[PDB]
C-alpha cells in the first residue's frame, strides 16, 4: 500500500515562529489534480481532529496559522506562528489506496528558557502507616526542559530502591514540565529512619536543590 | 449533534476474547460506515477494520487478520468490535470514528474510547491517602498540597480536587507500574491565604471498579 513517513519525530519551535513538519509517502496519492491527505492533531489524553483536508484546504473551525502545502508524495505542514495552544502530536493520513494507514507520529513542543524546578517533598499520611506502609513523595514542578534527576537519600545515605517516577507532558499555558517521586518503604523502615532528603539535578543549578524533612 | 459512545476501559487476560460497543447518536447508523483506529502510546494510530453496517461486509487489515472481528446492530444503532487472543503489543487504546465522504474521506467524528489492558492480574480498588507537608520553613507564600493514589488496576483512574472545584494549579501525574499494581499521584498549589480558609480534599474515581475515594487533606 502507501506507507507515510513523518520526519522529524519530534520538534521543539519557540513562540511565534514557524513549525514545518514533512509527510513523506511511499506513492503518490494525488488523483486527479486533487491530492489525498487529511492532518491531524492529537492532545494526550484526547481523540485526534482533522486540520487540513486535500493538504490544501483549511477545516471550518481550525484557526487560520494552521496550513499545509505539497503535491506528490512530499507534503508539508506550516504553522505560523506558534502559540503556546499549537504544542500536540501530529498525524498525517492517506486515503488514495488500501488498506489506509496513518502516519508515524510528531510531537511539537514549544521552545522558551530554561526554568528552575520547585521541589516540595511530602511525609507519609498516618493512614498508610496503620496499614503497615509508607511513602515518602516529592514533588518537582514548573521545571524546563525536562531533563532532570532526583535523588534520594535518608539519613545521608543515598537510596535507589523502591522508587516510583513519573513525568508528565507540557503543560499548555505555562510551558512547563513536572515530575514526582514516590520512595516506598515499610513501617519498621520508617521508624528506623529519621532525615528523609530529596535532591533535584537539573540544567538550571549546579548543584542539587536539597529539600527535607526530620520525622 | 452526532456522538460516538464507548466503555472507559476493559479488561482481558491474554488469549481471551472480548468484544467492544461503539454507540452511534446523532445521525442514521446505516448511512454511514464505521473504522477502527488503534493507539499504543509511543507507537502512535494504527487501522483496524472497517465496517458496512447494511449488509455486515467487513475489510480488516493484514496485521488485524482473524485477530478482529466487526459486527453492528441496526435497531441499536451500535457497531461492536470483537477481539480474539489479544497480546501484550495488543494493549492500546481503541477508538471508532465516522468516516465523512466528501470526495477524499476524512474522519469528522470520534469515540471516546476503550484502554483494553491484556493481563492475568484481577481488578484492584485504589487504595487513596493525603499527603499533607505538616511543617515548613515559611520561605514562600504559596503552599503545595498533593494527594497519593497506590495499588490498584488497571488503568486509568479519575483524581480531582475538591471534587472539580479546583480547575487551577493542579496537576495530575499519570500512574506507574510496580508489582503489577498501578501507582499515581497529584498535586495543587494554592495561596497562604486559601489553605487555611479553604478545606482541600481528594476526590479520586475509578472506572474500572466503580469505586470512590474520598480524602481529605
Known amino acids: 500500500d502507501i506507507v507515510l513517513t513523518q520526519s522529524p519525530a519530534s520538534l521543539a519551535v519557540s513562540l511565534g515562529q514557524r513549525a514545518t513538519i514533512s509527510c513523506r509517502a511511499s506513492?503518490?496519492?494525488?488523483?486527479?489534480?486533487?491530492?489525498?491527505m487529511h492532518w491531524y492533531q492529537q492532545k494526550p489524553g484526547q481523540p485526534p481532529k482533522l486540520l487540513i483536508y486535500?493538504?490544501?484546504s483549511l477545516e471550518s473551525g481550525v484557526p487560520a496559522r494552521f496550513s499545509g502545502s505539497g503535491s506528490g508524495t512530499d507534503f508539508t505542514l506550516n504553522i505560523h506562528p506558534v502559540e503556546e495552544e499549537d504544542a500536540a502530536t501530529y498525524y498525517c493520513?492517506?486515503?488514495?489506496?488500501?488498506?489506509?494507514?496513518f502516519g508515524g507520529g510528531t510531537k511539537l513542543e514549544i521552545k522558551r528558557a530554561d526554568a528552575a524546578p520547585t521541589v516540595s517533598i511530602f511525609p507519609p499520611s498516618s493512614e498508610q502507616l496503620t496499614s503497615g506502609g509508607a511513602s515518602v513523595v516529592c514533588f518537582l514542578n514548573n521545571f524546563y526542559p525536562k531533563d532532570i534527576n532526583v535523588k534520594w537519600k535518608i539519613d545521608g545515605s543515598e537510596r535507589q530502591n523502591g522508587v516510583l517516577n513519573s513525568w508528565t507532558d507540557q503543560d499548555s499555558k505555562d510551558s512547563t514540565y513536572s515530575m514526582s517521586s514516590t520512595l516506598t518503604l515499610t513501617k519498621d523502615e520508617y521508624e528506623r529512619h529519621n532525615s528523609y532528603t530529596c535532591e533535584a539535578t537539573h540544567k538550571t543549578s549546579t548543584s542539587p536543590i536539597v529539600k527535607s524533612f526530620n520525622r | 449533534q452526532v456522538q460516538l459512545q464507548q466503555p472507559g476501559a476493559e479488561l482481558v487476560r491474554p488469549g481471551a476474547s472480548v468484544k467492544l460497543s461503539c454507540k452511534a447518536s446523532?445521525?442514521?447508523?446505516?448511512?454511514?460506515?464505521m473504522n477502527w483506529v488503534k493507539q499504543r502510546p509511543g507507537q502512535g494510530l494504527e487501522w483496524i477494520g472497517m465496517?458496512?453496517?447494511?449488509?455486515?461486509?467487513?475489510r480488516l487489515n493484514q496485521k488485524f487478520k482473524d485477530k478482529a472481528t466487526l459486527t453492528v446492530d441496526k435497531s441499536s444503532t451500535t457497531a461492536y468490535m470483537q477481539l480474539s487472543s489479544p497480546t501484550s503489543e495488543d494493549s492500546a487504546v481503541y477508538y471508532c470514528?465516522?468516516?465523512?465522504?466528501?470526495?477524499?474521506?476524512?474522519?469528522?467524528?470520534w469515540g471516546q474510547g476503550t484502554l483494553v489492558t491484556v493481563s492475568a492480574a484481577k481488578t484492584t480498588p485504589p487504595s487513596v491517602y493525603p499527603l499533607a507537608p505538616g511543617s515548613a520553613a515559611q520561605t514562600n507564600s504559596m503552599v503545595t498540597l498533593g494527594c497519593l493514589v497506590k495499588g490498584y488496576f488497571p488503568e486509568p483512574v479519575t483524581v480531582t480536587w475538591n471534587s472539580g472545584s479546583l480547575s487551577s494549579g493542579v496537576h495530575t501525574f499519570p500512574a506507574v507500574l510496580q508489582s503489577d499494581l498501578y501507582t499515581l499521584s497529584s498535586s495543587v498549589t494554592v495561596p497562604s491565604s486559601t489553605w487555611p480558609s479553604e478545606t482541600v480534599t481528594c476526590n479520586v474515581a475509578h472506572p474500572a471498579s466503580s469505586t470512590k475515594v474520598d480524602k481529605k487533606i
Open positions: 446523532g445521525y442514521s447508523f446505516t448511512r454511514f460506515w
Open positions: 470514528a465516522r468516516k465523512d465522504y466528501d470526495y477524499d474521506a476524512w474522519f469528522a467524528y
Open positions: 506513492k503518490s496519492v494525488s488523483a486527479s489534480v486533487y491530492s489525498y
Open positions: 493520513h492517506h486515503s488514495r489506496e488500501l488498506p489506509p494507514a
Open positions: 486535500l493538504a490544501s
Open positions: 465496517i458496512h453496517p447494511s449488509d455486515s461486509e467487513t
